[PDB]
Structure formats: C-alpha cells, structure tokens
Design a protein around this ligand. Structure first.
Ligand SMILES: O=C(O)C1=C[C@@H](O)[C@H](O)[C@H](O)C1
Length: 264
C-alpha cells in the first residue's frame, strides 16, 4: 500500500482525491490512499520531508508550486520551462518535480488552431502558453494587469517558438485581439474576468481555469454566444493523467477518471 495526496492552501475543495482514488481503484491499487493536506509554501518542505517510505508522490497546488520546484533535486525540462511544479515524485535519492498543468491545458483543449489569447500573467498562465504551443498555436496575445510578469510571459512564448505579445487590459486592444483569436484561456479570478465578459464573448473556444463556483460569468457569456466552453475541471482531469502515471507506473485509466469527473 502506497500514499499520495494533494498539498496546498486552501485545500478543502480539491477534487484531486476523487480523480486519483478512482484511478487507483481502476488500476487495482485498492489499498492506496490520497489525502488533502493544508500546506502553504513555507510548510511544503516540512510536509514532504516528513513523508514516510510509502509516499510515492504528491500533487501540489497553490501556493506551493514554486517551493515544490526548488525542493526537488531533479526537475523535468518542462517544469523548468514554466518555472514551477505541481507534481513531486519520489526517486531513489530524493524528489523529482514536474509540471503537468501543461497537459492540463493541451489535453483539455484537445486540439487548438492558430491564434490564442491568454488572460493573466501568473498562476497557470505559463503552462497555458506552453500547452498552446504544444497544440500548434502560432500566435499568442497575453492580456494581463501586471506588465512585468507579462513581459516574462511573452519571453517564454518567444522561447517556445510562438509569436507572442502583450496587451494591457484597458489599453483598448481587447476587441481587436479577440477578433483574431480562436482560443481563450483565462487564468484570472472569475470576479476579475466578469467585467470583460461582454467583449470576450465572441471567442470561438473558451478554456476557463476556474471550476468552482460554476459557471463563471465569462463561461456563461461565451456559452450564450455558442462558443465552445471548457471548465477548469477538464483541466484538472488532464493534468491528473500524468500524475497518476508517475505515481503508479501504469497508464492513466482515462475512462474511469472521466467517469469520476462526470460525477463532479
Ligand atoms: O487539486 C487541485 O485542485 C489541483 C491539483 C494540482 O495538481 C493542479 O496543478 C491544480 O493546481 C489543482
């Protein structure tokens, strides 16, 4: 019997356990556990360092993804690329960090086209840029309140080979930018995105990182316009696949986990 779980703060509303435990059950690992652990960035090394032998790995959500990357002694190329880690996996002599949020975005969208818009400069925005690139997006516009963080974002886009640019939230380029874009990935609070819903509504595809509560005003706006709408639950589903494979050494049982998600 092995142990995994999810670290973050707050953590009470994580739907990670539902996904992972459904996977372990489908895989015949009926005796494995997965627990929610209240844990801020400073406490991450306390918790992970205290893990007994039977811990195979842990998921890490806000606010500890930067601490997780630094705590690990090995990091995947992609974890380095986005600058944070949502996944710690025990190895012979320590921990390996990875970032599966990239899979979260690429897998949730399933397929992307040419032009994308990313709302927000932090959180899962870097993963969204890399995932969009993975899908064959040639062009990305970063709409964000923090011009400095957004500068680092365009740089990453530039580095993964995507024509990438910045646009201020109230500069007046939002209509233009929405017009050229096929896909919108929003990583900002629903409360913040809400006021721009009218302008963003015409995007053909929305990926909203938010999942609770649902629908966000943005999702409702896009939905009413007939755009394809994908919630953060779909993101959660797809980032979890690679975590299950790394924790168990077995293919993610996607159907079982998709069923578990429908229950959510
Ligand atoms: O349980 C959750 O809500 C999450 C699990 C993390 O691995 C994901 O990266 C995301 O941050 C959320």
């Amino acid at each position: 019997p092995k142990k995994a779980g999810v670290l973050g703060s707050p953590i009470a509303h994580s739907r990670s356990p539902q996904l992972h435990l459904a996977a372990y059950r489908a895989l015949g690992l009926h005796d494995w556990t997965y627990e929610r652990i209240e844990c801020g960035a400073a406490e991450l090394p306390v918790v992970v360092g205290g893990f007994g032998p039977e811990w195979v790995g842990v998921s890490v959500t806000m606010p500890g993804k930067f601490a997780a990357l630094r705590f690990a002694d090995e990091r995947t190329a992609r974890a380095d690329l986005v600058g944070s880690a949502n996944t710690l996996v025990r190895t012979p002599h320590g921990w390996r960090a990875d970032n599966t949020d990239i899979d979260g975005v690429a897998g949730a969208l399933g397929a992307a086209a040419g032009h994308a818009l990313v709302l927000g400069s932090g959180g899962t925005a870097p993963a969204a840029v890399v995932g969009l690139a993975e899908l064959g997006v040639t062009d990305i516009t970063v709409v964000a309140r923090n011009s400095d963080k957004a500068a680092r974002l365009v740089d990453l886009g530039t580095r993964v080979g995507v024509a990438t640019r910045f646009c201020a939230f109230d500069s007046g380029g939002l209509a233009d930018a929405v017009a050229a874009a096929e896909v919108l990935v929003s990583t900002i609070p629903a409360e913040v995105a809400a006021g721009y819903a009218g302008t963003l509504a015409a995007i053909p595809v929305l990926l909203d990182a938010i999942y609770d509560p649902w629908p966000t005003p943005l999702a409702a706006a896009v939905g009413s316009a007939g755009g394809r709408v994908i919630s953060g639950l779909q993101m959660l589903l797809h980032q979890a696949f690679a975590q299950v494979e790394q924790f168990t050494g077995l293919p993610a049982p996607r159907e079982a986990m998709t069923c578990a998600l429908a229950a959510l």
